[PDB]
Amino acid sequence: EQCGRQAGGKLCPDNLCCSQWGWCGSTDEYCSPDHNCQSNCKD
């Protein structure tokens, strides 16, 4: 994992959203509170 709880709080590089699964990205699956985004989230 790159980020979030799974990685002990690591933040993603390049302002990327940390998904509920602990991976970094920029689409709704990573960024939406409806998908339990962990950091650098939208809304």
From TrEMBL:
<feature type="disulfide bond">
    <location>
        <begin position="17"/>
        <end position="31"/>
    </location>
</feature>
<feature type="disulfide bond">
    <location>
        <begin position="3"/>
        <end position="18"/>
    </location>
</feature>
<feature type="disulfide bond">
    <location>
        <begin position="12"/>
        <end position="24"/>
    </location>
</feature>
<protein>
    <submittedName>
        <fullName>Prohevein</fullName>
    </submittedName>
</protein>
<feature type="disulfide bond">
    <location>
        <begin position="37"/>
        <end position="41"/>
    </location>
</feature>
<feature type="domain" description="Chitin-binding type-1">
    <location>
        <begin position="1"/>
        <end position="43"/>
    </location>
</feature>
